[PDB]
Design a protein around this ligand. Structure first.
Ligand SMILES: CN1CC[C@H](c2c(O)cc(O)c3c(=O)cc(-c4ccccc4Cl)oc23)[C@H](O)C1
Ligand SMILES: CN1CC[C@H](c2c(O)cc(O)c3c(=O)cc(-c4ccccc4Cl)oc23)[C@H](O)C1
Lengths: 810, 810
């Protein structure tokens, strides 16, 4: 149908149809009379998977022969989403498969909806890892993603009585056609035990063993015939485990629990033993695999020339002392040489400055679980602090500030400090964030080793986040400037010369309207909810957090409702306000915010005076596949975190690429987005980082705003009196109390400017032509935010490898 | 190479080679450079599996169109062993695959050794179910095996310091290429809860739900293009299960533990809640599946015309009250009609008279776990006892003897009594056993309903137990009488006219010698043990039991050793005595017997005076695949259970078919074997059932035998004094004490006759020609013991269906 989806050749379509039929018969053991839509999905998935294998085998053979430097990306999270469409896009198979399935009497889009998300992440950090894998493959890097194959990913969110309920994401129930189990490469991982000192060094003995079994998933590059590997580890008990008889067999579950479930916390540290086991498990298995591959090319001097290890946050920070352990205890290298190798191998990416996200593990936990690693950490700390003392003589407070060991009620290890000490590079994820690192939380470390500190502004893959989810937009762009932008997103700048093109303006606006109609149809079919497709689609989708300020959005929504009720017969630009996202199960305030949103909707959506002028919808079970549906349909992107709290954001970039305008604070990557597009083409409001700092010095008093803003007073009175909860008048007492007395994120301080700025949004939306022209200026300048750019910078500035767009032979 | 293994056509070999290469590439994602022998095994397994699917789909389609009466074989155990060779045999693919793999540079026998046994059974009962499935498919019956897919089957046995050690049989570790998961046919199973009585009957409410997910395995008939199904259920927690968050997800293991592990007890009842859950789990899921299929053909009058349910022992006895529950509570049938349907549908097979194997469940367990079933059982009991009282008025002791409810310290339900009441047929498994049932333990029931009681003498499949494991013998037989005997084993009688044929005598003896050489080679390669292949191979392989009397064998072994030591320079026929089998982990005495065997070997095998005249070897990890190796190599089959204790035995039949002579008591199927071959061609010794009865009346005094038999006294003195355990003199005190004071199985009473009979064995072995002629008379008369005969009798006399040897179109 459309050009960017590839060719549907006679030979290809015929071959796909026959291989589809073969898989239905031989693989699924079904015929057409009994086959269900799910059977058809699997037959298609297996058919497409067949096209990967040849390329997958030859890519890995190529790496064996050429022996390039290998990149190992370690993450506890890989938020992959669905794989079928992505694979078709990257292999240029989409139109051929669409045709083949059509001739078989099947609708391919319907089959695509059957695939479960691989929801092995919480949000931004996990999705970044996924975009990165795509970009590394597209840029021809010898890269491997290493993580955990969780049996249960991020929970499925149900809304019951306006409240979040959690249920197990049993994503493997029907099988996963993309993975290949590799039980032959199973490796042992050690826990507990004790340290013995002998004539020939330290020995870690009397350990409990858990097996790590790898599952490999192919990662295809964009039309370059490169297929890289994501290797995920699964926990297995050894066969002599606890070996009355029956109980010993049942107790194997204890060992296998390590890979059972993803901790559902977004930017929050929970200091639980099971989590620590997961972190060591992935690190220990991964490092053995790395060393084995390195030896199969004695001399570890060349190790950093052949290996790079990227730590996605501090979660895999144990890689540092584990590498030291292997090199010193097992390979018998001297400390100083092992350390040189470790530092030159490892690099660390920081994702947040928020204190509650920082990993600080109790010494007593590491003492019991990983006794040798604790000893190595103490030794790292001693040697590091000796360097600090020699650089800054007599500065005793600096020594205590920089220590990897934090003294107090319970002694803890600061994992971020460990990462900085043991890495040759430390990066933040947006320019403002990286500057904050150097100026505040890691200031001491920056003064000691300034060369270590870098910035690598985040990005998103334009394959998933444009071509896949918004083919209509990708096509009208390709009609003007060709297809090369898909792997060179900077070419979108060429669209600036079409900002006054009447045909293009009409086409951009038409693509948006179609996306909005499709999404309005999705909502009725799957959730029986009625929305006006001619209204402004105002969307905030992201994890529920106090720092992300869904509450500020709530306050605006109520303001609009109150204004309508005061002057019912006045014209207002109609809006559909959509808010979605998951709350961590134990995050009480975030769960209260969800209830508030649904409670507002219950009042607003049923007021006859409002009509279809204002609608408030909570988007249930927000996840990658839902993002691919709602983001193309959005007019307004809400990016309204308190300045200095959102390190980068990536959701912001997805909206920019897909033709929504942004209302946002000067926070994270919003700053660079506004800089690229021009501040005139962005709806910027609120305190800057400097303004937040000034308010903190003075002391934030929420009462001041309550006293001086009558519209804000009314909302607080409504919340307090039970206007939004008639049967439970005091339901939102915690929210009001927080806002009035302990709001770390200064919701009231940005309220006036936010409301004013929203009025300017509505004014522009009244002028469709000028709305769309501003949209074109955003899309045209979104190129910087391709993860291809991000990965090219990691490659050249951290990993010491050169990216390549050259094809491998098919 | 050999005729019975089929044709190796040019077209077939070429096709197999290309499909092997396809699977290696696309399925295993490997090329020849990195592929391991295991990869080659899987490529072959997938290639052979492809040949099943067409036949599998069309067989099940055939049953849908013709709508025959369906046979449902319910068992907690299916001891399948390996599947690859069996599938090739039944599809006539063995020579073609041998050729195809040879041309690829691979040895097929080596690849066959890679496959794990499906060890989902303990011994005889589980292996009987497996032979039955093979025969039902070969006889064209619309049959389904229903069981549990245990994650862990019968433990792998290791011998350490002469002691049995157990380890988990992780048989699914590398995957199972034969099964097809069917998550779409998942069914709920209910536990706990309570009973509510309403206006419209009883209701079972507030239950906990466990999901039952089916996995289907193909069961191919012998060259008839029929492929039947074995459906095994796996336990899955529902997604809202226990839905802090993390613990709730981890607690899903509790539900899934139901299908985790096979109880490793052979002919022994262990009254554990987990076992009861397994028994209900298989029954509840199976019965829903049966009823669904029956409806997809309102009127349950035709139910018994379309459905037969065979209960393999009392393990699935809950099928009776569960069928009543569904028919009465859910379908709203009146009691009397539901009962009529139930009785006409169900039939029960008894496997033993030993009291410790009989299932007697505490009322309090059923009360908590299955409250509605307990109520139904009480009602069954009341109505049944009203029938007894009307038939035998005033016989109050009969009422208490026949009750399904046993009164005492703890009230129990007798599951065997339940089965008899609710079945239209009850069978024993050998003529002597079935007579014992009618005369002793079920005498009261026989007097009430004599028409119910039948015999169905056990059998073994000649495919696995001759063609597969002994191709050399199968071939020399086929050279004389053709191939038709493989599915009509009675044709072996034609071999009687070759008993004086000098060529045949030479060939039979040559095949045995080759088998013995092959097995002697297997022992050195895998276990580094040296045996003399010219010695008499004296073997007892079966589960370790007091009733099976491995101890009597031990006493003979010691007698032989003592006789050699007394007269070293006297000629004796050299023997290799092999004993193998697993002990239930909690069966202390059986574990002591294993230690005794190894302890005897330690002394005997290292005495220089003995030389290679006597060797004692414990065969480690006895299982189906080992049986297929040792049975063809055996000269003498030890079948020496106390008369009246071994219901049938099936190991006995395997040895008879494979050219070993039998030393045995008149017990189980030994009686019918001797009757078929002629008592002159069997080494029968010891007490008959009548002699055992007479000794019990008088009182068994072991001291009498000790006092009057000097050779026996010496052995007991040796055991007591520490001759076989110098460092632990009192090691075997328990064994001696048992033998002298509490031996329920009268080891001493059969000792003299056994030793005398063994002397007659050695005498015959000295005359190779006459040994072999007696062998020919055994093989020639083994036809009755084909499971094809057994299944034809079940079909005609219990199930009301006619077997068919007619081919389905390929
Ligand atoms: C004082 N108390 C407030 C709640 C907080 C908390 C919980 O008790 C439980 C949670 O799951 C979370 C969470 O997911 C994220 C954040 C969080 C994360 C970043 C910034 C600010 C906050 Cl409040 O906080 C959480 C912690 O107990 C400290
Ligand atoms: C008195 N005591 C003896 C041991 C017996 C027992 C155990 O304690 C544990 C077991 O695992 C078994 C077993 O597997 C088989 C038999 C058994 C089975 C059939 C006939 C005779 C016997 Cl002894 O007995 C077992 C039971 O506790 C009664």
């Amino acid at each position: 149908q459309i050009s960017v989806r590839g060719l549907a050749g006679v030979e290809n379509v015929t071959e796909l149809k026959k291989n589809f039929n073969r898989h239905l018969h031989f693989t699924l053991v079904k015929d057409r009379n009994v086959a269900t839509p799910r059977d058809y999905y699997f037959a298609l998935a297996h058919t497409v998977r067949d096209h990967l294998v040849g390329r997958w085998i030859r890519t890995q053979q190529h790496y064996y022969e050429k022996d390039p430097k290998r990149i190992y990306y370690l993450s506890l999270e890989f938020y992959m989403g669905r794989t079928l469409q992505n694979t078709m896009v990257n292999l240029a198979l989409e139109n051929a498969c669409d045709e083949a399935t059509y001739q078989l009497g099947l609708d391919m889009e319907e089959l695509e909806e059957i695939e479960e998300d691989a929801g092995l992440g919480n949000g931004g950090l996990g999705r970044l890892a996924a975009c990165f894998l795509d970009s590394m493959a597209t840029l021809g890097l010898a890269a491997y993603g290493y993580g955990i194959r969780y049996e249960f990913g991020i929970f499925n969110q149900k809304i019951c009585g306006g409240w979040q309920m959690e249920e197990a994401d049993d994503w493997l129930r029907y099988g996963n056609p993309w993975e290949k189990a590799r039980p032959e490469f199973t490796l042992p991982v050690h826990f507990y035990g004790r340290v013995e000192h002998t004539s020939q060094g330290a020995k870690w003995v009397d350990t409990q063993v858990v097996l790590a079994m790898p599952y490999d998933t192919p990662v295809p590059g964009y039309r370059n015939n490169v297929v890289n590997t994501m290797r995920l580890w699964s926990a297995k008990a050894p066969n002599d485990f606890n070996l009355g008889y029956i109980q010993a067999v049942l107790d194997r579950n204890l060992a296998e629990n390590i890979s059972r479930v993803l901790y559902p916390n977004d930017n929050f540290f929970e200091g639980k033993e099971l989590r620590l086991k997961q972190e060591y498990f992935v690190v220990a298995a991964t490092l053995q695999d790395i060393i084995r591959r390195f030896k199969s090319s004695t001399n570890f001097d060349a190790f950093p020339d052949k290996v790079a290890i990227q730590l996605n946050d501090t979660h895999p920070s144990l890689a540092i002392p584990e590498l030291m352990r292997v090199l010193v205890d097992l390979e018998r290298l001297d400390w100083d040489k092992a350390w040189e190798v470790t530092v030159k191998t490892c690099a660390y990416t920081n994702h947040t400055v928020l204190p509650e996200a920082l990993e600080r593990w109790p010494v007593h936990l590491l003492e019991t679980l990983l006794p040798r690693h604790l000893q190595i950490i103490y030794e790292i700390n001693q040697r590091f602090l000796n360097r600090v003392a020699a650089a800054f003589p007599g500065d005793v407070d600096r020594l205590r500030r920089m220590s990897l060991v934090e003294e107090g009620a319970v002694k803890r290890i600061n994992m971020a400090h460990l990462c900085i000490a043991g890495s040759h590079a430390v990066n933040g994820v947006a320019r403002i964030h990286s500057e904050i690192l150097k100026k505040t939380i890691f200031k001491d470390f920056y003064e000691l080793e300034p060369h270590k500190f870098q910035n690598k502004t985040n990005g998103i893959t334009p394959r998933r986040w444009l071509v896949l989810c918004n083919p209509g937009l990708a096509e009208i762009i390709a009609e003007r400037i060709g297809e090369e932008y898909i792997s060179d997103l900077d070419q979108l700048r060429k669209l600036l010369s079409y900002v006054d093109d009447e045909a293009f303006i009409r086409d951009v606006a038409k693509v948006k309207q179609e996306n909005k109609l499709k999404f309005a149809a999705y909502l009725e079919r799957e959730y029986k909810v009625h929305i006006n497709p001619n209204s402004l689609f105002d969307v905030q989708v992201k994890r529920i957090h106090e720092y992300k300020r869904q509450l500020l959005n709530c306050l605006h929504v109520i303001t609009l409702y109150n204004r309508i009720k005061k002057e019912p017969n006045k014209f207002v630009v109609p809006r559909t306000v959509m808010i979605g996202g998951k709350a961590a199960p134990g995050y009480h305030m975030a769960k209260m915010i969800i209830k508030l949103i649904t409670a507002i909707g219950d009042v607003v959506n049923h007021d006859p005076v409002v009509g279809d002028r204002l609608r408030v919808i909570f988007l249930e079970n927000y996840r990658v596949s839902l993002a691919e549906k709602v983001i193309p349909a959005a007019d307004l992107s809400e990016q309204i975190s308190t300045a200095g709290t959102e390190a980068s954001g990536t959701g912001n970039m997805k909206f920019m690429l897909n033709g929504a305008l942004t209302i946002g604070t000067m926070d994270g990557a919003n700053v660079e987005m506004a800089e690229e597009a021009g501040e005139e083409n962005f709806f910027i409001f609120g305190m800057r980082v400097e303004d937040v700092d000034r308010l903190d010095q003075r002391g934030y008093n929420a009462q001041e705003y309550y006293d001086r803003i009558p519209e804000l007073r009314q909302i607080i009175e409504q919340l307090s009196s039970g206007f939004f909860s008639p049967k439970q008048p005091d339901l939102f007492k915690d929210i009001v109390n927080m806002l009035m007395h302990h709001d770390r994120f200064k919701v009231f301080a940005d309220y006036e400017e936010y409301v004013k700025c929203q009025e300017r949004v509505s004014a522009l939306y009244k002028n469709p032509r000028e709305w769309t022209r501003m949209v074109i200026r955003n899309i045209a300048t979104s190129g910087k935010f391709s993860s291809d750019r991000t990965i090219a910078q990691y490659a050249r500035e951290i990993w010491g490898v050169e990216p390549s767009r050259q094809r491998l032979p098919a």
